[PDB]
Design a binder for this molecule. Sequence first.
Ligand SMILES: *P(=O)(O)[C@@H](CCCOC)NC(=O)[C@@H]1CCCN1C(=O)[C@H](NC(=O)OCc1ccccc1)C(c1ccccc1)c1ccccc1
Lengths: 27, 10, 253
Amino acid sequence: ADCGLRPLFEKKSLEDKTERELLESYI
Amino acid sequence: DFEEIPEEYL
Amino acid sequence: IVEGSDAEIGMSPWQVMLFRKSPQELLCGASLISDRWVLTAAHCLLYPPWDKNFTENDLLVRIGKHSRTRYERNIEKISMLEKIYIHPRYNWRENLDRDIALMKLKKPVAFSDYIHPVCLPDRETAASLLQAGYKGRVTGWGNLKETWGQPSVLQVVNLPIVERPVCKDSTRIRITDNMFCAGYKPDEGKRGDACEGDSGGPFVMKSPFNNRWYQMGIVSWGEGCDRDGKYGFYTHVFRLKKWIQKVIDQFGE
Ligand SMILES: *P(=O)(O)[C@@H](CCCOC)NC(=O)[C@@H]1CCCN1C(=O)[C@H](NC(=O)OCc1ccccc1)C(c1ccccc1)c1ccccc1
């Protein structure tokens, strides 16, 4: 529903320190 | 090593 | 988790600790998939070779935690189990095929900044993200080393999914389609693995299409921790989703 959207990160549009590593590996 | 938890849960 | 890092606060709000009531200790990881259902590895609850066979009353679920050992007053929520459900074709005798279980909570847990459910993948999610080289994230309070320490706080490590032939060639265990393996190769110069006590926790990925986190795997097994040329193996959540669906619509929220 709201699954998978973190209150302290996606909900406030803040990124955590290593999620960019994941997104750089996707393609 | 684990801190005591309230007895309501045990 | 070997060679990871301390989680940030609220980084993995679906993280659940399975906690043994007596003796008081960490039993495994787990994840929050709704306000009344928790996902884990079957072998956290049932594993005859080790004389493990927990009933509902033997454990508690601790949600919203960060510190491993401290009682995080006003942050964590401690929940009792209503009923445990193990996959009926879980193979504990040989290779932990279908290593998956659900636990229904006695009461709904309230969501907060620290407590929030992860998504479960649909077929397209799995097809697009479960590819060799794509990285997922594993989290847990398990051992920091194969043999020694223990962490103060939740640990995190990002690891790439490994080609199926490379997984198979690393092990003597029979690998099935219900499993996938992840970790760096020796030549890659990066390290990291799950270790004892991390089982049951989640391997998650963040879809670049909808910006949501999905739980693609469950920490299941590995030959030691962070050994060169070995890889961790995870239950493939999408392959077991029909079973998940069936128990939740027959019994749950
Ligand atoms: P979980 O209970 O935290 C998790 C540990 C994964 C992290 O890496 C160890 N799962 C396991 O420990 C499962 C539960 C049954 C044993 N099993 C294993 O993963 C076996 N691993 C093994 O014995 O490694 C030695 C070890 C492990 C941890 C710490 C120190 C030493 C695994 C296996 C055994 C033997 C050869 C290859 C693999 C296994 C897999 C499937 C069925 C049985 C045993």
